Design a protein around this ligand. Structure first.
Ligand SMILES: C[C@H]1CC[C@]2(OC1)O[C@H]1[C@H](O)[C@@H]3[C@H]4CC[C@@H]5C[C@H](O[C@H]6O[C@@H](CO)[C@H](O[C@H]7O[C@@H](CO)[C@H](O)[C@@H](O[C@H]8OC[C@H](O)[C@@H](O)[C@@H]8O)[C@@H]7O[C@H]7O[C@@H](CO)[C@H](O)[C@@H](O[C@H]8O[C@@H](CO)[C@H](O)[C@@H](O)[C@@H]8O)[C@@H]7O)[C@@H](O)[C@@H]6O)[C@@H](O)C[C@@]5(C)[C@@H]4CC[C@@]3(C)[C@@H]1[C@@H]2C
Lengths: 55, 55
């Protein structure tokens, strides 16, 4: 609605913060306002299920 | 010895080629002369063994 970045990106856009070191997943629209570095930690959607029981 | 990039990087450094779309693993020294994009294909050293079949 407001098209205002909240969170850590809006602290970088509006000059509140100087840099961000955080678990920040790189999307396109985040790069449209600020600059990422290279992805140091590649990941994705994993499948968390239970562990086979000791019954 | 010559400190001359051969291959596809030296074609980008010496103006022979315009861009590289290739299986090019990102290192530091390759970024020291040319610019990569984001890693579209993350990978690493895998373990190729035989498929086990009825020992
Ligand atoms: C309750 C809130 C709700 C929301 C809100 O309402 C109220 O609305 C928000 C709104 O959004 C406001 C934001 C708007 C966007 C603003 C952006 C501004 O930074 C801008 O301008 C520079 C800082 O002033 C930034 O980059 C500086 O800091 C480094 C960023 O990485 C740069 O690298 C450095 O450039 C170089 O400076 C000299 C040296 O080489 C090095 O130190 C440096 O590499 C720049 O520092 C200054 O660098 C000088 C030379 O470039 C200029 O002083 C200026 O750079 C250029 O700035 C141009 C801006 O027009 C200008 O035209 C051009 O001539 C200047 O050369 C810049 O200052 C640059 O990345 C960015 O664009 C920031 O500080 C404040 C800012 C975030 C504002 C903070 C407050 C808000 C968030 C408002 C507030 C939350």
């Amino acid at each position: 609605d407001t098209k205002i970045w909240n969170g850590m990106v809006g602290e970088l856009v509006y000059g509140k913060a100087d840099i961000a070191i955080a678990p920040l997943t790189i999307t396109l629209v985040r790069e449209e306002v600020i600059d990422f570095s290279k992805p140091f930690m590649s990941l994705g959607i994993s499948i968390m299920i239970k562990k086979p029981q000791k019954s």
